[PDB]
């Protein structure tokens, strides 16, 4: 209407409004105390209500941008705390807003946010639920000022439900700790996934992005016509482009518009949207993004007629190459919800390479007659990797699977740090356990998505402290080529072994009184260092050692003296091992 603020307040509801205002202020004023933000929230909410009562009331017809920037510029310590950010206030909109946006600090220097003990958390949750949760929301938003505010709200509500259920359980910790871990990991991945999509857009351009959206939306909405998918791809590309620039309101409005269009057109798109489309504005976009794949229509024909048989392939291609490739991609993807999106794009690139060569060659239709054959080994490559790795997972369990991976990747890239090798290997093993309990139909997209996050963490860490030319290569490739680049890593025959360090392999009784988790990580750290010291060590030779180390740890955590069993048996274990592996 006349009043954007009034209109937001009506659409979100007072509770969501207050939480979004808190996140937004926290994201821009990363260094003000919680109590300051509480007071800004209350003033803004007060003013909002006046508008709701009367859109003609004073100031109620200013833009949300103008109101927000005005409010920021009234912060008394703005120059003293934020330095050059206060210079934004000398500008008029929209420059002022742009200026504010650029001064968000993606790397604030704040202490890590520690998880308190369970009884401490549950007690504060009971004694003042609202401030417990809102102060958490503030601590998180100010540490991640680009994280999309409504998704951050969706996480906050899941935490609230976590505390609600677990703080009244018999074993509070056993209930609560798994949920907090799950949520922390989902959140960190979700944020790493937003960042990664924006970086890929930048580096690879808008056409690769559109290719990716085609494949993905085509899998999702297999009954939509190409021109409907193409339309969503164009809109989605705009949404993601604007959301990467970072203005909350511009991103939210784009996301709302698309959700609305989709909901007004369910019968052209998918039959699984009814639920999402009935949800309030706040949750619509999010629910649609997560909607399960529609059913494939059923009597769909071979792509042969259109894409290989037809006289006109080269004509139809030449007339609009991306549209033709896009149609190829659409028809492929909609028939294959069981493929990774990156597999579909390799196949599209193969087809494109083939048309480019064949359509300019002596006999086009002869030249590309056999193109679909090129696809077979690109499909089977990941399928067979999934079966080889998942069989290994079933034989070993998760922990021993992680150990095999640790041995595996240490030999390939022994220049990687141990903590990186250990974190990534543990994490890849978690992808094992997650995705290998899916049936075939769902295995490839599972791995793609979870691998995408682990192999991005790997790349993130590594480009921060570079050490392997091979890893930097795989990290700087197209996202299409990232994972196969990693699967092609070969043992580093060039590697000079690490020199023996007695400390590295000295163990104390404190390890008997460590978490299951933390003991594992110390055993896995030693395993890596064992491989880094004896890289040519054999599978039988490694297992001999592990079996002895295992015996050792039971023995020395089972005695009346602990301290010296660990020093005494230790010296013995290490001696035995150093001559077993020659
Ligand atoms: C989202 C806003 C509410 C979150 C409640 C935070 C609980 C504390 C978790 C600390 C982070 C962690 O280590 O898991
Ligand atoms: C109608 C939307 C445009 C779709 C363009 C199709 C391009 C398909 C083949 C090339 C694959 C690009 C993958 C990449 O380089 O990241
Ligand atoms: C005395 C109260 C003055 C009212 C403050 C303005 C309320 C609107 C807040 C808009 C927050 C959105 C931030 C953004 O995306 O840039
Ligand atoms: C003043 C408060 C306005 C904050 C802007 C966020 C609006 C959230 C609407 C969600 C749109 C969406 O993601 O689909
Ligand atoms: C699977 C596509 C269905 C379309 C649903 C529209 C929502 C996508 C918006 C994406 C960009 C927003 C920023 C983010 O939260 O990552
Ligand atoms: C260990 C994790 C389970 C097996 C993963 C094998 C790779 C799957 C490849 C899927 C995505 C892609 O096509 O690159
Ligand atoms: C640095 C650690 C090496 C990373 C290995 C990533 C491989 C992902 C897919 C599984 C495979 O083919 O080995
Ligand atoms: C280089 C010779 C010193 C060898 C010392 C033994 C190192 C043992 C670490 C093995 C990790 C145990 C695997 C496990 O059971 O979790």
Swiss-Prot record:
Keyword set, alphabetical order: Calcium, Cleavage on pair of basic residues, Copper, Disease variant, Disulfide bond, Glycation, Glycoprotein, Lipid-binding, Metal-binding, Methylation, Phosphoprotein, Repeat, Secreted, Signal, Zinc
One example GO MF annotation: identical protein binding
Ligand binding (Cu cation): 1
Residues modified to Phosphoserine: 3, 56, 63, 271, 417, 487
Record carries keyword Nucleotide-binding: no
Result of altering residue 370 to E: In Naskapi/Mersin/Komagome-1
Residues the record lists as N6-succinyllysine modifications: 203, 434, 517, 562
Ligand binding (Ca(2+) 1): 4, 242, 247, 250
Result after altering residue 65 to A: Impairs metal binding
Matching SMART domains: ALBUMIN
UniProt effect for mutating residue 311 to N: In Canterbury/New Guinea/Tagliacozzo/Cuneo/Cooperstown
Effect of residue 499 to K: In Manaus-1/Adana/Lambadi/Vancouver
PTM-bearing positions, type N6-methyllysine: 532
Mutagenesis or variant effect for residue 373 to N: In Nagasaki-2
Residues the entry annotates as binding Zn(2+): 65, 245, 247
Gene Ontology terms: cellular component: blood microparticle; cytoplasm; endoplasmic reticulum; endoplasmic reticulum lumen; extracellular exosome; extracellular region; extracellular space; Golgi apparatus
PANTHER family: ALBUMIN, SERUM ALBUMIN-RELATED
Family that this chain belongs to: Belongs to the ALB/AFP/VDB family.
Identification of the protein by name: Albumin
Protein's gene: ALB
